[PDB]
Paper text:
Potyviral CP plays a role in virtually every step of the viral infection cycle, from transmission of the virion by aphids, virus assembly and disassembly, regulation of genome amplification, protein translation, to cell-to-cell and long-distance movement. CP consists of a highly conserved globular core flanked by two large extended regions with a high frequency of structural disorder. The C-terminal high intrinsic disorder region (C-IDR) is partially conserved and packaged in the lumen of the virion, supported by the helical ssRNA scaffold. Here, we show that we can control the shape, size, RNA encapsidation ability, symmetry, stability and surface functionalization of nanoparticles through structure-based design of CP from potato virus Y (PVY).
In this study, we found that the wild type PVY CP can indeed form three architecturally distinct types of VLPs simultaneously. The C-IDR is structurally defined only in VLPh+RNA filaments, i.e. in CPh+RNA, where the helical scaffold of RNA supports the cone-like organization of C-IDRs in the lumen of the filament. The fold of the CP core domain is conserved between the polymorphic filaments, except for the conserved RNA-binding loop S125-G1306, which adopts different conformations in the presence or absence of RNA. In all three structures, there was no cryo-EM density for the first 41 residues of N-IDR, exposed on the outer surface of the filaments. Beyond H42, N-IDR in CPh+RNA folds similarly to that in PVY virus, whereas N-IDR in CPr and CPh takes a different turn at K53. First, recombinant PVY CP can simultaneously form three architecturally distinct types of VLPs. These filaments are mostly RNA-free, of either stacked-ring or helical architecture, with only a small fraction of the RNA-encapsidating filaments resembling the native virion. The low proportion of RNA-encapsidated VLPs suggests that the efficiency of assembly of RNA-free filaments is higher than that of RNA-encapsidating ones at given conditions.
Residue numbers in the entry:
A (entry chain Bu): 42 to 54
B (entry chain Ac): 55 to 267
C (entry chain Ae): 108 to 267
D (entry chain As), F (entry chain Aq): 162 to 214
E (entry chain Aa): 55 to 107
RNA sequence: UUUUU
RNA sequence: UUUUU
RNA sequence: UUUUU
RNA sequence: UUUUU
RNA sequence: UUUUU
């Protein structure tokens, strides 16, 4: 169970 | 004596004797399951995270809060431990989709948070930072020293008193303001008056009754 | 409707009967939450919702004593007031109706709880008045002959 | 005339997302629970609670 | 009793039992490692000082 | 229309250096944490926090 | 009563 | 609503 | 009497 | 009920 | 959270 890394500005906005 | 309306009994004894809900399920100080589901979906969609690795993020979020509070004014990022690395997640989805408040949303995590703090208190002294800020002098009450603790009928009397005193000391005499500065800025009236080349001044048209000598 | 009344009585035994309660109140359907708006409950209650729910006092006390037989069930109002005695859990709701059969200790506990909850809440008879216009309507005319939008002539003015 | 349905609609939208009407944002209302009452064509009746009034 | 959303549990017990971060690492009253690194780099570049001294 | 992306961009630039938009400097805003909200075309929504509003 | 964009 | 360089 | 969320 | 960073 | 020179 790795810990995810999110982006600054997601394209889903 | 039971409530009556037009002679007919208002209650239902058969259902009442079998109606035994959990206290935290009907409590007003905790977000409803619908609101919790909406917040969870909104956070998951905002983070662009699938169902497999969202529980890990929830694990990290619960720990972060046990330490640094659940105020409505928290901003910036919250951090997670990936081994020895810091993973920073924005705090906007967590606090902006939380209805009615983030504290009432995180009250769902209260039992697991207490269990986690009691478990961390087995291999090292682990007092949550909220308990340090309130200057709690008893380590044994470390499982009860977070701001989103949910007092239930099973909470011991000493723990309940300590939590109440901590809440009273933290809130102090904070006055609640219902309004802020109004958004309507224009306090004057629009000047519909015309301006013409015949005017004697930009502010006046003629000097009608003025008499020179 | 009696089932809904059953759920409403329980919800209140826990979360109070103030005039300012809003939102929704929940009922247990097995393991599911059923949410009912609280506006009909508090808007049609005369003179107050507390006085309406005082009719449920005996059944509420019986229900709390019955729930206190299979698990520790202190109503949330008794937790907020920090009541240190579980045996007085049947008496720890805000719509309790003190009668001549209520024991002296229960009566004293209820009175102290009410005094601690009400504190020194000042009662205001009025709020901000709804009449907003504090000025007078400007019935004065405006004409092309005016020297300014605020003045008609400059009558006595003498230039030098 | 639309006041009751408008209040019901705002309370219903306040169940799946935070929905404060823009009039309530302009007036800088700091309480979300009073979002059903924050439009300019609200019609105060005898059933409107004192705090909302 | 553990948090649930649509019947599925929200937390992860297996990772939670093994999640033991340092308190100062997740604390809000201390700059993040990224911010500390950025400050250190900025100070080093401004001082025109190499890594040795 | 660019308000959400502008706020996200200012919060992202506020991760590698202090980036207060010049509009926030002109208005003499004394809090850096409110740098994502300090442009004149900000669009206040129901998700904007009370302090930011 | 109106004046709340 | 506009008027925030 | 009300004011106890 | 909220207000506990 | 900030505000401790």
């Amino acid at each position: 169970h790795t810990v995810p890394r999110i982006k600054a500005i997601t394209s889903k906005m | 004596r039971m409530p009556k309306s037009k002679g007919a009994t208002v209650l239902n004894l058969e259902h009442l004797l079998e109606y035994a809900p959990q206290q935290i399920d009907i409590s007003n100080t905790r977000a409803t399951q619908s609101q919790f589901d909406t917040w969870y979906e909104a956070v998951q969609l905002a983070y662009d995270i699938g169902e497999t690795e969202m529980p890990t993020v929830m694990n990290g979020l619960m720990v972060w809060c046990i330490e640094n509070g659940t105020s409505p004014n928290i901003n910036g990022v919250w951090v997670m431990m990936d081994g020895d690395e810091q993973v920073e997640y924005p705090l906007k989805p967590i606090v902006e989709n939380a209805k009615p408040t983030l504290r009432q949303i995180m009250a769902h995590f209260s039992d697991v948070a207490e269990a986690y703090i009691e478990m961390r208190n087995k291999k090292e002294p682990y007092m949550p930072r909220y308990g340090l800020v309130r200057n709690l002098r008893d380590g044994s009450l470390a499982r009860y020293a977070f701001d989103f603790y949910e007092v239930t009928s099973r909470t011991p009397v000493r723990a309940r008193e300590a939590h109440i005193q901590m809440k009273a000391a933290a809130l102090k005499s904070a006055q609640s303001r219902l309004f802020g500065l109004d958004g309507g800025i224009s306090t004057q009236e629009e000047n519909t008056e015309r301006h013409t080349t015949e005017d004697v001044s930009p502010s006046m048209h003629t000097l009608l009754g003025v008499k020179n000598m």
